[PDB]
């Protein structure tokens, strides 16, 4: 049998994205954060093209297509960055981009050291849990459907159905080489715990970038058009409790 679903996920996976950072200059808070912001703007373009090509994405109402992207981009990008770090440098550093790799010194200079250490822990988990390339792809897609508004989406029903379908595909990938219910159950527990762990990290970064935007003119940090719009209009909805992640486990 042909793995149609997985064939598609592999086929649409975005290529390499560079930040455009000048690594010839001594590190500074302003330059490092401005480059992270530009990388965010560039990655946002690839995330939109990727999402629009996902199986069933068009089943969603137009307004909800935009909403899920605007709310889950931070988690999606952090998860992908953690995987790149694992595969390219065995979690020795944070591989934001080929031209923007963070060692401990840069983590400190960025003023978000604690958050950076938590992301490195996430990267290490990909190795400790022996996450396969196929599990990574399915889990990343699921992250796009893991944060919603308390007030509900325009067509909450279509969303619930799509999310359920991606969960079913994850079950299938888990059952592939496993011919025992207990083994599958144990793996599902591990993967759902890993997925939940992304949310608290994304929340801390949401708070950090929000505060940075508010005082950006005082610290010389540049925010591109799309990033500035999303962080001033959508991010505060999550910080004020109007939009919340869907956790598998209670915590």
């Amino acid at each position: 049998c042909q793995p149609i679903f997985l064939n598609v996920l592999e086929a649409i996976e975005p290529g390499v994205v560079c930040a455009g950072h000048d690594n010839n200059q001594p590190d500074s808070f302003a330059a490092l954060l401005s480059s992270l912001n530009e990388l965010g703007e560039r990655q946002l373009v690839h995330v939109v093209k990727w999402a629009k090509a996902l199986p069933g994405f068009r089943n969603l109402h137009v307004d909800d297509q935009m909403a899920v992207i605007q709310y889950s981009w931070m988690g999606l990008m952090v998860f992908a960055m953690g995987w790149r770090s694992f595969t390219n440098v065995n979690s020795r550093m944070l591989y934001f981009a080929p031209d923007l790799v963070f060692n401990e010194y840069r983590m400190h200079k960025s003023r978000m050291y604690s958050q950076c250490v938590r992301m490195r822990h996430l990267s290490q988990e990909f190795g400790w849990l022996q996450i396969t390339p196929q599990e990574f792809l399915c889990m990343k897609a699921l992250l796009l459907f893991s944060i919603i508004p308390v007030d509900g989406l325009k067509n909450q029903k279509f969303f619930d159905e799509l999310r359920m379908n991606y969960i079913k595909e994850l079950d299938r990938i888990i059952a592939c080489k496993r011919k025992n219910p207990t083994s599958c159950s144990r793996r599902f527990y591990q993967l759902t715990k890993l997925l939940d762990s992304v949310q608290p990290i994304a929340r801390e970064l949401h708070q950090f970038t929000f505060d940075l935007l508010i005082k950006s003119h005082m610290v010389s940090v540049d925010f591109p058009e799309m990033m500035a719009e999303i962080i001033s209009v959508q991010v505060p909805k999550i910080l004020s409790g109007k939009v919340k992640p869907i956790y598998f486990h209670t915590q």
Binding site: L44, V45, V48, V62, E225, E229
Partner: peptide
């Protein structure tokens, strides 16, 4: 402006 536009 025009939101993300390329949605």
């Amino acid at each position: 402006h025009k939101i993300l536009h390329r949605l």
